[PDB]
Amino acid sequence: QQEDNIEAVGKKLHEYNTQFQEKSREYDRLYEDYTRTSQEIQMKRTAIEAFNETIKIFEEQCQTQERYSKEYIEKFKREGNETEIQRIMHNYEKLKSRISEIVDSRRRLEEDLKKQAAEYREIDKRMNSIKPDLIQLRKTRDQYLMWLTQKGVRQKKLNEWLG
Amino acid sequence: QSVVVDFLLPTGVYLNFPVSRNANLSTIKQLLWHRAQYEPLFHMLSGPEAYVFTCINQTAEQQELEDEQRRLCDVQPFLPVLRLVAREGDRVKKLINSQISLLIGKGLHEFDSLCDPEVNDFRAKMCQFCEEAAARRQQLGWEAWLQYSFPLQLEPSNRALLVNVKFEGSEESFTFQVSTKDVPLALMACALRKKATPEDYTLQVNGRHEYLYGSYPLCQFQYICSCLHSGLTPHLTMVHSSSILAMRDESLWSLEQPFRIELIQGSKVNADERMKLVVQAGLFHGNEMLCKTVSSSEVSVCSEPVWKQRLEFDINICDLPRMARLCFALYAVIEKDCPIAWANLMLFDYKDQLKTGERCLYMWPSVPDEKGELLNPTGTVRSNPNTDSAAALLICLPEVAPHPVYYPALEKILELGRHTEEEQLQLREILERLYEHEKDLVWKLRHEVQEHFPEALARLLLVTKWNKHEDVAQMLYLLCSWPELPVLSALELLDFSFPDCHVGSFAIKSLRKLTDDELFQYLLQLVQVLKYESYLDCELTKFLLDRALANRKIGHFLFWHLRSEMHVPSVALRFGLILEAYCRGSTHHMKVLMKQGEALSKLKALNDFVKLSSQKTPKPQTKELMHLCMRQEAYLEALSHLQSPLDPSTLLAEVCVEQCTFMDSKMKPLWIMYSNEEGSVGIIFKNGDDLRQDMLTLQMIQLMDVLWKQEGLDLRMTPYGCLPTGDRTGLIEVVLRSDTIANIQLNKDALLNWLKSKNPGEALDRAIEEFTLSCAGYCVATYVLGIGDRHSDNIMIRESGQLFHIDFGHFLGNFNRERVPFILTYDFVHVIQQGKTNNSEKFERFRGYCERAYTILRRHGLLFLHLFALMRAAGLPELSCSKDIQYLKDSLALGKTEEEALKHFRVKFNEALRESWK
Numbered sequence A: 001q002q003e004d005n006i007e008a009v010g011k012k013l014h015e016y017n018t019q020f021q022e023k024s025r026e027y028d029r030l031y032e033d034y035t036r037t038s039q040e041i042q043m044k045r046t047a048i049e050a051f052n053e054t055i056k057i058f059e060e061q062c063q064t065q066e067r068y069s070k071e072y073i074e075k076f077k078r079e080g081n082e083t084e085i086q087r088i089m090h091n092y093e094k095l096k097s098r099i100s101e102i103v104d105s106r107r108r109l110e111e112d113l114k115k116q117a118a119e120y121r122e123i124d125k126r127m128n129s130i131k132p133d134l135i136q137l138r139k140t141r142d143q144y145l146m147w148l149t150q151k152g153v154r155q156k157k158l159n160e161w162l163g
Numbered sequence B: 001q002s003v004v005v006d007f008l009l010p011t012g013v014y015l016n017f018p019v020s021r022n023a024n025l026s027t028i029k030q031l032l033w034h035r036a037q038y039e040p041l042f043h044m045l046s047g048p049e050a051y052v053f054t055c056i057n058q059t060a061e062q063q064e065l066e067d068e069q070r071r072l073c074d075v076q077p078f079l080p081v082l083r084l085v086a087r088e089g090d091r092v093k094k095l096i097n098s099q100i101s102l103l104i105g106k107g108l109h110e111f112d113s114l115c116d117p118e119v120n121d122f123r124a125k126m127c128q129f130c131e132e133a134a135a136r137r138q139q140l141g142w143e144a145w146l147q148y149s150f151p152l153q154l155e156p157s158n159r160a161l162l163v164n165v166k167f168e169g170s171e172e173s174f175t176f177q178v179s180t181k182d183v184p185l186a187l188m189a190c191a192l193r194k195k196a197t198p199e200d201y202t203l204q205v206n207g208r209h210e211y212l213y214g215s216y217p218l219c220q221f222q223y224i225c226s227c228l229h230s231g232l233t234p235h236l237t238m239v240h241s242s243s244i245l246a247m248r249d250e251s252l253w254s255l256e257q258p259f260r261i262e263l264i265q266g267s268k269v270n271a272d273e274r275m276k277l278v279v280q281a282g283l284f285h286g287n288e289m290l291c292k293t294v295s296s297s298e299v300s301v302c303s304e305p306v307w308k309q310r311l312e313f314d315i316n317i318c319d320l321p322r323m324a325r326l327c328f329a330l331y332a333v334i335e336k337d338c339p340i341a342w343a344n345l346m347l348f349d350y351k352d353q354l355k356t357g358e359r360c361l362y363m364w365p366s367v368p369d370e371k372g373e374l375l376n377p378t379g380t381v382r383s384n385p386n387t388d389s390a391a392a393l394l395i396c397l398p399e400v401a402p403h404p405v406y407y408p409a410l411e412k413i414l415e416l417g418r419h420t421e422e423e424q425l426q427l428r429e430i431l432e433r434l435y436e437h438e439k440d441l442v443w444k445l446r447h448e449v450q451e452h453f454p455e456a457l458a459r460l461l462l463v464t465k466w467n468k469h470e471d472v473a474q475m476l477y478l479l480c481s482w483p484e485l486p487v488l489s490a491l492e493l494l495d496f497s498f499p500d501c502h503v504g505s506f507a508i509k510s511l512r513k514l515t516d517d518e519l520f521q522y523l524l525q526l527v528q529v530l531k532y533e534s535y536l537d538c539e540l541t542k543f544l545l546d547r548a549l550a551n552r553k554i555g556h557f558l559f560w561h562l563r564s565e566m567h568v569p570s571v572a573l574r575f576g577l578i579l580e581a582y583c584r585g586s587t588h589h590m591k592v593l594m595k596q597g598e599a600l601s602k603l604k605a606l607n608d609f610v611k612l613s614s615q616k617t618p619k620p621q622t623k624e625l626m627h628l629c630m631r632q633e634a635y636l637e638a639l640s641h642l643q644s645p646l647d648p649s650t651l652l653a654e655v656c657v658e659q660c661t662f663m664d665s666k667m668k669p670l671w672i673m674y675s676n677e678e679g680s681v682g683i684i685f686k687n688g689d690d691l692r693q694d695m696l697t698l699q700m701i702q703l704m705d706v707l708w709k710q711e712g713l714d715l716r717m718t719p720y721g722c723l724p725t726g727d728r729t730g731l732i733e734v735v736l737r738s739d740t741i742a743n744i745q746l747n748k749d750a751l752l753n754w755l756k757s758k759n760p761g762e763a764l765d766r767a768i769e770e771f772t773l774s775c776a777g778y779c780v781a782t783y784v785l786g787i788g789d790r791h792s793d794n795i796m797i798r799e800s801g802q803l804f805h806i807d808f809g810h811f812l813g814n815f816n817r818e819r820v821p822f823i824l825t826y827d828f829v830h831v832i833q834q835g836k837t838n839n840s841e842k843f844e845r846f847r848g849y850c851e852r853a854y855t856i857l858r859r860h861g862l863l864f865l866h867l868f869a870l871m872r873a874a875g876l877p878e879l880s881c882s883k884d885i886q887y888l889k890d891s892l893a894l895g896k897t898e899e900e901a902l903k904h905f906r907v908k909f910n911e912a913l914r915e916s917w918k
């Protein structure tokens, strides 16, 4: 209605405690990376919003350039000043070519964010594979420790095995 | 030192050319106009002062850059892109809104992007409330503004010493004798007659924003008390009320159907394919299950698992309490355990409406811990902000009526809530000194508890059955007519066990008695409790904001407690919104915090330079390479001239660059020294470790010092400042004129002869008493708090004689957690006895001090327990479970009597004296 020797059990307490501590360190490494990568992903997504607002301002400027230039391109054409129109339109082309650089820069960040999003999921997967081992090694350590406390082993002798 | 900047003119024209990073915006605008004249459509532009630059700042917001004395490197635009726009409209709100975003470390657009009514109504209500108080502050007088800005720093509460008085502008000073117990109106009158040979002036300490005024005597001020005890003469200044104004200007119970929910789908799960996924679920109120924990059927491990299951609980819809939370947990079992993630959800919303429709809960990852529970009901209700990457569970609360249904009002609850000597003897035994039989007894005698046992309201709330709506209404009926409890009891009611909104409201109602002095002692604890709050708009948040607007110092420390956890995703939203409201109601202090932020921003970059240089080059070269980075115009101006984060009355004026340095530690702590018209002040900028642990300990030592000082016992402690400012970053106050024990010793009379050099002749007998008093206090403090890992490297002594401890890494038994014994070092006992092998008279005083100290803390033992209990919110490893709180119960020995506890303390004292020789 409800078994090895004490020295042999204490040996296994030392082994299982070492295996637990190693896995505890390994998880703390992966959790550090999980913490770190979460900050980096947020920064990247905040930077993409910045890219968007930058590009938004450039597109507002392109709207301003087309609306404002309608009056003066016509006026300089009447006065016979085709050279002033050439300055205006080439400047607009110089504005447009800069956007292509900023748009190209935004795409690189989006691709790094895609690669870093995979790594986040890969780390979290590696964490969730170790949790079974870590939780079980905590339980096993505790059960052997409680077994020896029942058997009546001194606290000083348990500390040697735990270390 | 140069960068190519895109310029966008309001005619649509685009200029592009290099400028220096150190060059300010006003200078940049002049170079722009000089190149704009050689580009089309120049004639149609107005003058440069008609326009203002706009950039995209680091938080991805447009910022109208009104202050053109800012350097482009200090502005920190995302890409080097400036755009000219019209300098008109409501520029006041525009300037503040952008300056807030940078200051809090979060863009205000991120609050808008959520499209959340709860957020928008918080912003609406709190900003309006805060703006009104700031307006009302300005209409009020100069004396009241002085109370707000520069509140009285007093000691916890007959001689005739000199005092060097001065006036604003004049170089001459006046030294003359004045008594210790005089009221400062008299002190001004004496100096005012000396000017010729009252109510329109106020006194001020030199090189400080600490003002002497009000009904209190001169002895109760910290500046005076420090000057009397040390020996030096107070140096004051007489400021006029005009100069102060210059600073001021310049139905639910119907629906009896059982509760249920549709578990639809999971998203973005990352687990081992061999296993199968299970969704554990359960309802909660505080840290108590309302019903059984329902579980789902098993599905194979993929990214997008599907269930589509009904999950019926054993509780009715009518029976649910106000603060009911559906707590989830995603696991990974084997078909015939692994916690992946968890998420909590409040059944009723902030407006009291029961939630319906689909809810996409973005889950938090599960950490394995010593408890190892199924669910995590103590966790935050707010969803994970990393939405696109992190996992989630699609669920759906079903419809239960044609129209929606609310949780009943206070009126309707009161209506439902209405209606021997043997059992009364049993109630005494339970409360004065809980099991299932005791719970039903107390609930039966709940009316007698209200009448005869007001202090045990907390006990009555736990025994109440929150899963039955009948029991809830009866408890709330009693609560709304419950008599006002003291501070000490009210602090207990703020804990995670008491989630109910009426209970919180009662707890805050009792805390309105707090003085600003006493509130400051519990401010850290009160900040941490906000993690347990469910909704954003709450009484504790309002209470904290009320006091911050009332008192500038409280507001200052409220800012940095909240700001320092903006990196933490679980509180970034909640804290960010409070910091917004605070900022709007204290625009004057915003300017101060902006200097502090940018000073701290440079010290990070300065520490990172020193960290990289320490690996490559040696220390003497790196120390010189540090000063070059400091001496640059952007770095020097930002670090120079600001109020200290550690104490905003203290003025950090001139950076003494040559005196600055760094230690060769794990995290390489910077040592910044200052000098101002008073004398010297220093700080340590630590980046790498978390300083909350060290702060909490220093706060509790400071609390002991106050508690001892209230009982007529000044143990000459050194509770120096410690302030977390950010992500593993913070300042720490330099205790000047001091050194570590290791550096002094590196034998028998090592510390004794150190005191002889620093206190020769008559001062020696004073410094020993300073040592004896201080050592006693720190012996008792470290004992009670359970502080291990003490040694020569982390213990210090001042030149005046006071010993003090530093850098508290571990406490409450931890190092595995065992009882840390009482520790008396042979070297300290040698100094206490004045170089003698046996000196029973002096050692008996020292024994007396440690006993008197220890007894005083037992009288206020519940305070320490209640405060430490609330700090569990902070998620410190060494202060997590109830056994950590138990350490304090045993060390103070509150279960035992005052005689019994003191007899046990003497045995631990006597055993420490024996262990000193060994």
Ligand SMILES: C[C@@H](c1oc(=O)c2ccccc2c1-c1cccc(CN2CCN(C)CC2)c1)n1nc(-c2cncc(O)c2)c2c(N)ncnc21
Residues within 6 Å of the ligand: B661, B662, B663, B669, B670, B671, B684, B686, B694, B720, B722, B732, B733, B734, B735, B736, B738, B739, B740, B743, B793, B806, B807, B808
């Ligand atoms: C260990 C010492 C220290 O910490 C540095 O980080 C550091 C960095 C660059 C250089 C020295 C240092 C020193 C240091 C070491 C020996 C002697 C002196 C005095 N010196 C001698 C030269 N003499 C010319 C000037 C005074 C300081 N130290 N740590 C803390 C401290 C750190 N974290 C948390 C905390 O709760 C306290 C602290 C404090 N609150 N108050 C005072 N000292 C303190």
